[PDB]
Amino acid sequence: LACPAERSGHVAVSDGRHMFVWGGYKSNFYLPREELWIYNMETGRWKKINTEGDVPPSMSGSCAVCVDRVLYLFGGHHSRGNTNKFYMLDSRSVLQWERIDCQGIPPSSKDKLGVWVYKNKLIFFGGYGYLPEDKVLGTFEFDETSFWNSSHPRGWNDHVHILDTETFTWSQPITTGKAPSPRAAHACATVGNRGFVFGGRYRDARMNDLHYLNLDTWEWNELIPQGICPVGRSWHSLTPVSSDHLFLFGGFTTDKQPLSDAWTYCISKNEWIQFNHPYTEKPRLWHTACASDEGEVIVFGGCANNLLVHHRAAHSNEILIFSVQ
Ligand SMILES: O=C(O)CNC(=O)Cc1csc(-c2ccc3ccccc3c2)n1
């Protein structure tokens, strides 16, 4: 049966029963832009389709959502750099991509960010990319390691941007509270009107902090769980599994250890619980995770070692199924 190629930095979005996989890169360039891979969470079978229309460039680090079987794609890194273009693919009724001429001030061109979905709003936070074209709300910190290797320097931001799907208009909310530090390769998860974010890379650390932005008031809150917390990391996944639990898997520590640990964050108790699973010998970073209607968390792709050593990188095509409910 047909089987998608290994990759990291891809996107994966789900309607609870089907998982849509697009993009990413591997070793041994970018996976083909026109392909969309569909994994049936109930039958474990893959199915590939060719998409047409305004097919986005081949990219790593893009940020995607699925809302009522409409897929939206923002940002990423292609052969000629980062982007801030916005695409839509309606997976309801050959599938055609639409590139949206958004109104308003878009985010800076960037990748490795996250998104919360709340009613008509797609809310994007953070990431890695070029200096912004405007003194938009937030801060931006250059990554000094990008000064002497490329032609365009890059850095981290803490920006929050709203894409309103009633009008495809970009805006930025005026927030209160301590926003998280600028960061990339963090993970975001949404429960109700709370947009959680955990970890990420910033300057010389991969972080262990946990915050949530209230998506109704726009007030930041930093969460301080008691007792043992997971080690700081980037390139991990964070996924809602109930109205009270976020599921964490994998990532990459400050001192460059690939991770195979898994935790559940209980929101009501403000406590982490380590989760026991049979994939302890399968660390993953820059994988994706999607929750199914059937209580599972489906992890796909990602790299089993330090992907920054690109000629030795072990990118995966495996499906890891976590039975959290
Ligand atoms: O460092 C983190 O945890 C997340 N990264 C950042 O925040 C910014 C950054 C700075 S360089 C880089 C990066 C990414 C992927 C690569 C894949 C192959 C080869 C080199 C690669 C280099 N990313």
Author numbering: 26 to 53, 61 to 125, 129 to 360
From the paper:
CRL2KLHDC2 has been proposed as an attractive additional E3 ligase handle for targeted protein degradation. Specifically, KLHDC2 recognizes substrates possessing a Gly-Gly C-terminal degron (C-degron) sequence. First, crystal structures showed KLHDC2 binds substrate C-termini in a well-defined pocket lined by aromatic residues available to engage a ligand. Ligands were identified that engage the C-degron binding site in KLHDC2, subjected to structure-based improvement, and linked to JQ1 for BET-family neo-substrate recruitment.
We therefore tested if expanding the phenyl group into naphthyl or bi-aryl analogs, which could potentially better fill this pocket, would improve binding. Amongst the various naphthyl analogs tested, SJ46411 exhibited excellent activity with a Kd of ~260 nM measured by isothermal titration calorimetry (SPR Kd = 0.5 μM, TR-FRET IC50 = 3.9 μM, ΔTm = 6.0 °C). We also note that the 2-naphthyl substitution demonstrated greater activity than the 1-naphthyl substitution (SJ46411 vs SJ46145). A co-crystal structure of SJ46411 bound to KLHDC2 confirmed the predicted stacking of the hydrophobic face of the naphthyl ring in the binding pocket. The structure further showed the di-Gly portion of the molecule allows a water-mediated bridge between the thiazole ring and acid moieties. To evaluate potential exit vectors, we compared structures of KLHDC2 bound to SJ46411 and to a di-Gly substrate peptide. This analysis revealed that linker attachment to position 8 of the naphthyl ring would generate an exit vector closely matching that of a natural substrate. The data showed a greater than two orders-of-magnitude selectivity of SJ46421 for KLHDC2 over other KLHDC-family CRLs. Consistent with this view, SJ46411 and SJ46421 alone were only able to inhibit KLHDC2 substrate ubiquitylation and largely inactive towards other the Kelch family E3 ligases.
